Structures are given as structure tokens and as C-alpha cells.
């Protein structure tokens, strides 16, 4: 089977989420064929060169699972879009761009964090366009680490989750040639049927781990998303 998770927002001061995640790795990810993490895995990320003990311990826990043979794919979210190849190398995972189309038991399936669909938040979209400009990424990777912390504090202060724009879903799905989309970000776990030019399709939204854990599990026969307690 394959597992999909997102929006864990891992951080040292949330040891309940961490414990839930490491137990999920031991009891479920180890036995799966693949694990996909669709963004906002960490609550924030200043860059791989800023990793602390907590973040390194998470990489080491992923690496145990990858060494066991489970394929781990990590996609950026908006909170942790600076995660780099050095982190992924420690963790044994593959960085997946947003968007990516994967083959899922023979079906092409679109994966995204989801915030790119939330086009009605105009302010959010302006910030996102600045943050992902290649020139901004160039300058950020040339900023000293202490200055990146100063910027992160500034952005945190100068700033509830606006949901996806309905018409964007069929537009992007048709553009990638898929009838199944999986994303996170909106904190509204659900499966949405829809139409694409008269044809049925489906959008699956992953749950966030603030109050309970979540996982979507898929195999050739079916799929299910269900929560589980943090404690
Ligand atoms: Mn997000």
C-alpha cells in the first residue's frame, strides 16, 4: 500500500504530534511500499543549514524507514518550502516538486500541497509569488542564517485558512490529464467528487495533525482516510 500525510507542522514544543508521527512511522510507514508527505511537514524551515537537534532526529527517524525499503517522497508546503537536498539526503527521501503527477497503481494522480489553489486570498497570493520568485530564492540562500531568522520573525508578525477556489480544481486537473488529485493545506479532510468536461473525478484532501493524526492509505483495491489519536 501507499500512505499520504501532510500538515503535521512538526515542532519541538509539540511532542504529542512528534510521538504520534514516530509511532505512525514504526507501525504503518515501515510496512508500506511508499510514503508521500505533501507539505507543511515542519511548522517552519529556515534552511537546511539551520537544522537543530529536533529536526535532525526527525530525519534520522525517516531514514530508518527508508533504509527498510519504504520509498519516501517529500513535497514542500508553504511553511517549509526551504527544505533542501541536504535534508532529504539525511532522511533518505526524494524531494518531489509541487505539482507532481505520479503513477498510482496505474492511474495518473496529481499531488500538490494545495495552497496554490487558494487564489481568493489575494494578499496570500502576492506573498507567495514573492517567496517563490527564483530571485527571492537566490537571495534567501545567500542570507546569513541569523538574518533569515530575523526575516522569519518579521513575516510571522506581519501575519482563517481560505479554501481552494472551486474552478481551479478542474482547470489544473484537466491540465495535468488526471481524474484524481490529492492535496493538503486547507485542514478540511474530505473526498470531493467533481466533473471534468462531463467526466467524474475526485479531489482528496488530507487532514492536519493539530488535534489528531491523519493518514490516507491506498492500495490496488481501494483507499481510506481516517484519523487516530495523538496520545
Ligand atoms: Mn499550508
Centre of ligand 1 from the C-alpha of residue 100, in Å: 17
Q: How far is the CA of 43 from the centre of ligand 1 (A)?
A: 9
Counting Cα atoms < 13 Å in the Cβ hemisphere of 39 gives: 23
User: What span, in angstroms and rounded, lies between the C-alpha atoms of 175 and 82?
Assistant: 27
Q: Which of 55, 74, 61 is nearest to 30 (CA)?
A: 61
Cα–Cα separations (whole angstroms), residue 108 to 36, 96, 184, 212, 229: 15, 15, 18, 30, 32
Cis peptide before 218, with omega less than 30 degrees from 0? Answer: no
This structure was determined by X-ray
Burial readout 5-40 (b: 16 or more C-beta within 10 A, e: otherwise): bbbbbbeeebeebbebbbebbeebbeebebbbbbbb
CA–centroid distance, 114 to ligand 1, in Å, is: 7
C-alpha span between 149 and 45 (Å, rounded): 10
Q: In whole angstroms, what is the distance from residue 215 CA to residue 20 CA?
A: 12
* 198 CA distance to ligand 1 middle (Å): 31
Q: Mutual orientation of helices 122-132 and 134-142 as an angle, nearest 10°?
A: 60
CA dist 105 and 107 (Å) reads 6
* Beta bridge pairs of residue 29: none
- Closest by Cα among 67, 63, 58 to 8: 58
**If you ran DSSP here, which 8-state letter would residue 211 be given?**
S
99, 180 Cβ separation under 8 angstroms: no
Burial label, 4 (beta-carbon count in 10 A; 0-12, 13-18, 19+): buried
- Yes or no: say if 176 and 183 are a contact pair by the CB < 8 Å rule: no
Question: Which phi and psi angles does 42 have, rounded to 5°?
Answer: -105, 150
Q: Give, as one character, the DSSP assignment of residue 117.
A: G
Using CA of residue 23, residue 114, residue 89, residue 2, what is the dihedral sign? positive
Task: Provide the grid cell at 174.
Answer: 484537466
Please tell me the distance between residue 9's alpha carbon and the centre of ligand 1 in angstroms.
Answer: 9
DSSP string, 56-100: HHHHHHHHHHHHTT-EEEEE--SSSTT--HHHHHHHT-EEE-SSE
Question: Residue 40 C-alpha to ligand 1 middle, in angstroms?
Answer: 6
DSSP assignment of 178-194:
-SEEEE-SSS--EEEEE
Domain 2-228: which topology? Purple Acid Phosphatase; chain A, domain 2 (3.60.21)
> Strands of 71-75's sheet, edge to edge?
94-96, 71-75, 34-38, 2-5, 213-219, 222-228
List the 100-104 sheet strands across, edge first. 100-104, 107-112, 180-183, 199-205, 190-196
Nearest CA to 207 out of 32, 40, 62 is that of: 40
DSSP string for residues in 3-64 = EEE----B-TT-HHHHHHHHHHHHHTGGGSSEEEEES--BS----GGG--HHHHHHHHHHHH
Distance 32 CA to ligand 1 centre (A): 25
Amino acid at each position: 500500500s501507499v500512505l499520504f500525510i501532510s500538515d503535521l507542522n512538526l515542532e519541538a514544543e509539540r511532542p504529542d504530534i512528534t510521538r504520534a508521527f514516530l509511532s505512525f512511522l514504526d507501525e504503518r510507514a515501515r510496512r508500506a511500499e511508499a510514503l508521500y508527505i505533501l507539505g507543511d511537514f515542519f511548522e517552519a524551515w529556515i534552511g537546511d543549514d539551520g537544522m537543530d537537534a529536533f529536526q535532525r532526529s526527525i530525519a534520522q527517524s525517516l531514514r530508518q524507514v527508508a533504509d527498510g525499503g519504504t520509498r519516501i517522497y517529500l513535497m514542500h508546503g508553504n511553511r517549509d518550502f526551504l527544505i533542501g537536498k541536504a535534508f532529504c539526503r539525511e532522511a533518505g527521501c526524494t524531494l518531489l516538486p509541487d505539482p507532481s503527477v505520479i503513477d498510482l497503481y496505474g492511474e495518473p494522480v496529481l499531488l500538490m500541497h494545495g495552497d496554490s489553489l487558494c487564489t481568493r486570498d489575494e494578499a496570500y497570493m502576492r506573498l507567495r509569488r514573492w517567496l517563490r520568485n527564483p530571485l527571492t530564492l537566490w537571495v534567501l540562500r545567500h542570507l546569513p542564517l541569523a538574518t533569515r531568522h530575523k526575516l522569519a520573525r518579521k513575516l510571522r508578525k506581519e501575519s482563517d485558512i481560505i479554501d481552494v477556489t472551486p474552478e481551479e480544481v478542474p482547470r489544473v486537473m484537466r491540465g495535468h490529464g488526471v481524474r484524481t488529485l490529492i492535496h493538503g493545506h486547507t485542514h478540511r479532510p474530505a473526498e470531493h467528487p467533481l466533473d471534468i468536461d462531463g467526466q467524474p473525478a475526485r479531489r482528496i484532501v488530507l487532514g492536519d495533525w493539530d488535534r489528531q493524526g491523519w493518514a490516507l492509505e491506498i492500495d490496488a483495491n481501494g483507499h481510506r482516510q481516517a484519523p487516530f489519536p495523538l496520545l
